[PDB]
Design a protein around this nucleic acid. Sequence first.
RNA 1: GGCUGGACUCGUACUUCGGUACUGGAGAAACAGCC
Length: 17
Amino acid sequence: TRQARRNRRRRWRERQR
RNA sequence: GGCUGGACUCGUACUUCGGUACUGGAGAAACAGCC
């Protein structure tokens, strides 16, 4: 599913926010 | 959270109008796994 990018991309990206 | 993604509900695109697809969009690094 898309909830992988919403956990993989989400975990590497939130780090920036 | 130290790491991954399997649903949701949305917003937005599509589309048979069901339903899926976009986390270069959130609630929410929530829940599951290991907890």
